[PDB]
């Protein structure tokens, strides 16, 4: 009765992993499918500053003052 | 040395692995909950640029200058 | 034959041990940081507030008022 | 029964060695990276500093002073 209990639990351990392996794979396929943070942050920061480096050179506030200056 | 000890050992492995399976599941259900960084950035970066666009297009500094020019803003 | 089974089984255990410690480390790392949406909001707010303060503080106006004839 | 068990045990041990190495690597990866809140502070300060460069420069004064 001893050996069978060991046989049962051993079979269960070995089975148990295969769904554990499926999960570890999913975590590695998930980590290696996203972009790095520093590359992502540069690209969006560079977009914020570009969009604003343009509107500030746009000089929206020049009009009304040039209206009064004629 | 003996089958009795092996049995405790085997049971202990089994138990701990069960715990580990659940703990691994959690890691996955928590890297999975974390939604795209590349999508979260774009939405916030739009909100930053929108706000500061509203401010600039308000021309806060014209009031002082139009005052000197004798014209209402 | 129970010697070899005992040696393997101890080595399975000893490894689960180190495995355990790593999952713990992974769960601590992930579990201990602000949601991505939360951390991006405080930074964004930081930026706007840092830039509003400068803009509202009207830096370029004195050069104009000087040229206009004021001071 | 016994040789059966000795084989599943070898199989558990070997299959686990690969799991433990992948787990170590998951950790390796979440280490290679510096905290998200830590990298956002740095990229934020350059965003403001360089628009600070732009605004303090007064790109909109040239057109006003030309009328004065
Ligand atoms: Cl992450």
Swiss-Prot record, chain A:
Gene Ontology, cellular component aspect: host cell plasmodesma; virion component
What is the annotated localization of this protein?
Virion; Host cell junction, Host plasmodesma
Which GO terms label this protein's molecular function in UniProt?
DNA binding
Q: Which UniProt keywords apply?
A: Coiled coil, Disulfide bond, Host cell junction, Virion
Ranges in a coiled coil: 1-30, 37-58
Family affiliation:
Belongs to the caulimovirus ORF III family.
| Function description | Plays a role in virus cell-to-cell and plant-to-plant transmission. Interacts with virion icosahedral capsid and movement protein, thereby facilitating virion cell-to-cell transmission through plasmodesmata opened by viral movement protein. Also interacts with aphid transmission factor, attaching the virion to aphid stylet when the animal feeds on an virus infected plant. Aphid saliva may later detach the virion, inducing release of infectious particles when the animal feeds on a new plant.
Please give the subunit comment from the record.
Homotetramer, through coiled-coil domain. Homotrimer when bound on icosehadral capsid. Interacts with capsid protein, and with movement protein.
Q: What is this protein called?
A: Virion-associated protein
Stretch of the intact protein here: 2 to 71 of 129
UniProtKB/Swiss-Prot annotation, chain B:
UniProt keywords (A-Z) are:
Coiled coil, Disulfide bond, Host cell junction, Virion
Lineage in the entry?
A: Viruses, Riboviria, Pararnavirae, Artverviricota, Revtraviricetes
What are its GO cellular component terms? host cell plasmodesma; virion component
Which residue stretches, if any, does this entry annotate as coiled coil?
Answer: 1-30, 37-58
Localization in the cell? Virion; Host cell junction, Host plasmodesma
Keyword Zinc carried by entry = no
Family membership: Belongs to the caulimovirus ORF III family.
Kindly provide the name given to this protein in its UniProt entry.
Virion-associated protein
Q: What does this protein do?
A: Plays a role in virus cell-to-cell and plant-to-plant transmission. Interacts with virion icosahedral capsid and movement protein, thereby facilitating virion cell-to-cell transmission through plasmodesmata opened by viral movement protein. Also interacts with aphid transmission factor, attaching the virion to aphid stylet when the animal feeds on an virus infected plant. Aphid saliva may later detach the virion, inducing release of infectious particles when the animal feeds on a new plant.
The primary site where this protein sits is: virion
Q: Which domain of life is it from?
A: Viruses
Assembly: Homotetramer, through coiled-coil domain. Homotrimer when bound on icosehadral capsid. Interacts with capsid protein, and with movement protein.
One annotated GO molecular function: DNA binding
């Amino acid at each position: 009765a001893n050996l069978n209990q060991i046989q049962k639990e051993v079979s269960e351990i070995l089975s148990d992993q295969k769904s554990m392996k499926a999960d570890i794979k999913a975590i590695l396929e998930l980590l290696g499918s996203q972009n790095p943070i520093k590359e992502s942050l540069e690209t969006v920061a560079a977009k914020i500053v570009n969009d604003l480096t343009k509107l500030i050179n746009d000089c929206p506030c020049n009009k009304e003052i040039l209206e009064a200056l004629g």
